[PDB]
Design a protein around this ligand. Structure first.
Ligand SMILES: CC1[C@@H](O)[C@H](O)[C@@H](O)[C@@H](N[C@H]2[C@H](O)[C@@H](O)[C@@H](O[C@H]3[C@H](O)[C@@H](O)CO[C@@H]3CO)O[C@@H]2C)[C@@H]1O
Ligand SMILES: CC1[C@@H](O)[C@H](O)[C@@H](O)[C@@H](N[C@H]2[C@H](O)[C@@H](O)[C@@H](O[C@H]3[C@H](O)[C@@H](O)CO[C@@H]3CO)O[C@@H]2C)[C@@H]1O
Ligand SMILES: [Ca+2]
Ligand SMILES: [Ca+2]
Ligand SMILES: [Ca+2]
Ligand SMILES: [Ca+2]
Length: 404
């Protein structure tokens, strides 16, 4: 049984009294809902309030979310309920606190007395010409315009980041990682950190644009998109790695599918159209996150159909991730918990078998492990497609789930 929960949103840094402190009162409900892992925000000092422009990595007390003590208390509370903690790891880029003789901000500060993480321009990708000194390797991935991109091919960088990552586990209690902007560096470099820090899991954010057609909707055939994702997993070590990816393919397709086009939810070979259909053990599914939804709303799930999104991911193969807002702010707590309960009760996991029974525009019906049936869509009656012996267990707006 594995179910993730993103425990923060884009406004979390503003929480009066601190986000971690506030989260202490949410721990019990999260655990009671069947969540096994909670994804927490970047914990270190960051030039940006949300934490995605890290500077002094060891300086946890500088975070807007809370200090080391408050974070250790939250992780301990989670652990007390058998729930693991995932840290949002931002290492593609990093902000340098100090200026060098050239007057450029390329002298870094780890946040400790000694020289740990006290890098210089030699650790900045040579092609990030604004900050580099030209002695480094070329960026192994995409660039982040607002800050220096780190040269992960550098031996000291690899050595010290792994040391820092191990410290996050030993000193704070973190169990796993969420790799931010994984397109910023190669999967071979991500492999270095994953293999070297032994996380229970390492879910990477590998987000590529999804091809669309003349009508502005995504193309039905998204194989190229999920191919990129499976390729990343293969290069990170595949089944021999704790690494996995967020299923952005399923996110993109589902966004469009619920708008009267549920026929998009199956490929020509009868499998799920996203990563879930090719490598479910490595696909972390979701309805929305702090980027796609929340205040940024880069690619929001149709708001009136959010529960259809959860009926889908919480019953299907792959590892589902629940978004904080939908559970504690929107009124879907009970409905979401009921779906996770069905998942757990029936022993459904990431590799459970998926048999799609109907995939028409107004109705999608699927059977999982021959033990659970789920239906989403505006078409009310699908009774004719429900196998004998199944009885309705949970239902809501345009969704229903059956069990035996
Ligand atoms: C479990 C698993 C890994 O062991 C494998 O290394 C992955 O690459 C992926 N393997 C994928 C291919 O990466 C993908 O390209 C497609 O493979 C297709 C080809 O794309 C098509 O051109 C001809 O048929 C093949 C059927 O296997 O589905 C396979 C299941 C699979 O999830
Ligand atoms: C007699 C009967 C069957 O013919 C039907 O196929 C069942 O699924 C069930 N019908 C269920 C819906 O399948 C379920 O989704 C929810 O119905 C939902 C609608 O699906 C939703 O669009 C608006 O809210 C309703 C709640 O009242 O409860 C009903 C009792 C009903 O017992
Ligand atoms: Ca220092
Ligand atoms: Ca940069
Ligand atoms: Ca980003
Ligand atoms: Ca980069």
């Amino acid at each position: 049984h594995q179910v993730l929960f993103q425990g923060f949103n884009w406004e979390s840094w503003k929480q009066s009294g601190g986000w971690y402190n506030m989260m202490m009162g949410k721990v019990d409900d999260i655990a009671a809902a069947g969540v096994t892992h909670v994804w927490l925000p970047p914990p270190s000092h960051s030039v940006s309030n949300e934490g995605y422009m890290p500077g002094r990595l060891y300086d946890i007390d500088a975070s807007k979310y809370g200090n080391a003590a408050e974070l250790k208390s939250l992780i301990g509370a989670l652990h007390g309920k058998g729930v693991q903690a995932i840290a949002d790891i931002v290492i593609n880029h990093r902000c340098a606190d100090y200026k060098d003789s050239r007057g450029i901000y390329c002298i870094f500060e780890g946040g400790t007395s000694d020289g740990r993480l006290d890098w210089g321009p030699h650790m900045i990708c040579r092609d990030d010409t604004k900050y580099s000194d030209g002695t480094a390797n070329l960026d192994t991935g995409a660039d982040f315009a607002a800050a220096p991109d780190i040269d992960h091919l550098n031996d000291r960088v690899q050595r010290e980041l792994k040391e820092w990552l191990l410290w996050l586990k030993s000193d704070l209690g973190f169990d796993a990682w969420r790799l931010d902007f994984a397109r910023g560096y190669s999967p071979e470099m991500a492999k270095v950190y994953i293999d070297g820090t032994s996380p229970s899991l390492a879910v990477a954010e590998v987000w590529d644009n999804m091809a669309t057609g003349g009508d502005g909707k995504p193309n039905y055939d998204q194989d190229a998109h999920r191919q990129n994702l499976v390729n990343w997993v293969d290069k990170v070590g595949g089944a021999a790695s704790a690494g996995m990816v967020f299923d952005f393919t399923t996110k993109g397709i589902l966004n469009a599918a619920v708008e009267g086009e549920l026929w998009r939810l199956i490929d020509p070979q009868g499998k799920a159209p996203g990563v879930m259909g090719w490598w479910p053990a490595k696909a972390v599914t979701f309805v929305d996150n702090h980027d796609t939804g929340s205040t940024q709303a880069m690619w929001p799930f149709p708001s009136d159909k959010v529960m259809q999104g959860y009926a889908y991911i919480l019953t299907h193969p792959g590892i589902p991730c629940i978004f904080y807002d939908h559970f504690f702010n929107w009124g879907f707590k009970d409905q979401i918990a009921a779906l996770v309960a069905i998942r757990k009760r029936n022993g459904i996991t990431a590799t459970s078998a998926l048999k799609i029974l109907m995939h028409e525009g107004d109705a999608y019906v699927a059977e999982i492990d021959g033990k659970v049936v789920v239906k989403i869509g505006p078409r009310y009656d699908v009774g004719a497609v429900i196998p004998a012996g199944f009885v309705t267990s949970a239902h809501g707006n345009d969704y229903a789930v059956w069990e035996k």
